Structure 1
Amino acid sequence: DLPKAVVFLEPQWYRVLEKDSVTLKCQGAYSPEDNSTQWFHNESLISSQASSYFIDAATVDDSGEYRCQTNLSTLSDPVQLEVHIGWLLLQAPRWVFKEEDPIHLRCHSWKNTALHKVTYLQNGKGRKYFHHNSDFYIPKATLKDSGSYFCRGLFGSKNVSSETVNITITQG
């Protein structure tokens, strides 16, 4: 077991729409002798050396895998970032969960596009409905939560469904 650094996303969504803001933060110890950070994008070292890596407006090139490292923490596992372009996007912090983990999904709309009467669906069957767009929570994840997920709502009178994404729940 190595003291692996960890990259986490603020906000937590690993699937984002173009122009969204994303800040990547490295969870790792920083010694006073060497307080720099090594960031990697698609396995390649990048120039930024700060503990945080800011993406003001995300573009498709910002997509890919990210890793970080510090003097006291070893190379982290990769974190995946997907930049989507479309009217509607189902968001999640990851697609692999363990039993009892919380599952927090969000139905995100293109910039300046209100959305209402939102439904989260699992394997084609609806799971939760909201008249006003709200997030979907599952505090305790179970093996039955695995499946293909997508959200659909109303842009006024236009009924729209987001692209699907597969979630998997593993043993705890």
Structure 2
Amino acid sequence: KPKVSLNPPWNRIFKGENVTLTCNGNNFFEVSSTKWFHNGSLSEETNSSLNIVNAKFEDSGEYKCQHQQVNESEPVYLEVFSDWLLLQASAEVVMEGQPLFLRCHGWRNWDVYKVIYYKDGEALKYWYENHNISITNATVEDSGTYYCTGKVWQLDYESEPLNITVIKAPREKYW
């Protein structure tokens, strides 16, 4: 089962941004063997890299890839937003292992000041300029609703809530 990765990460993007979806897979049968599927449809891309430029509102949805035969690939949900502030996360089904990344992206590359992250009511971190959250090896308690409030063009704006779950250990056991 090939896994589709987005370059850059944070599928939550703004309108007019850039993404590139690619499923590597164990094999390297890129030539005329990668089928890219939007919502229950067939696209017109044969290369392993599907580049979305100027991402309109119609480009959102679930994406799948079908490198040669296999069975299928795990669908990836791409959502396009048009707010002043958007909270972008590296993953939302993140394991207890690989770290968790949070970014407060303003509209375009506009500087955002007085950025405050929230932790379901309780504020997490406040910084004078735009800052990232780089929680390495997030544990169980790092879950819930996250949103960032900032100051763009000397005016206060608030992002949209994002639900992040980290889940528990898979098996443990070991008697």
TM-score, with length taken from structure 2: 0.89
Aligned: 1:69 with 2:39 = no
Q: Which residue of structure 1 aligns with residue 131 of structure 2?
A: 134
- The within-5 A match list for 1:20-169 is 20-28=17-25, 29-31=27-29, 35-71=32-68, 73-169=70-166
* Paired residue secondary structure (2:148): strand
Q: Which residue of structure 1 aligns with residue 8 of structure 2?
A: 11
- CA offset digits 1:41-65 (Å, max 9, x no partner): 1132211111100111111111000
Give 1:113 deviation, angstroms.
2.5
* Paired residue secondary structure (2:165): strand
For structure 2, the 5+ residue unaligned runs are 170-175
Give the number of equivalent residue pairs.
168
TM-score, with length taken from structure 1: 0.91
> Distance between the aligned counterparts of 2:82 and 2:29, measured in 1?
40
Give 1:72 deviation, angstroms.
6.2
For structure 1, the 5+ residue unaligned runs are none
Give 1:119 deviation, angstroms.
1.3
Larger strand proportion of the pair? 1
> Between the two proteins, what is the percent identity of the paired residues?
43
Give 1:129 deviation, angstroms.
2.1
Q: Are the counterparts in 2 of residues 93 and 104 from structure 1 also a CA contact under 8 Å?
A: yes
* Paired residue secondary structure (1:111): coil
Give 1:74 deviation, angstroms.
3.5
* Paired residue secondary structure (1:114): coil
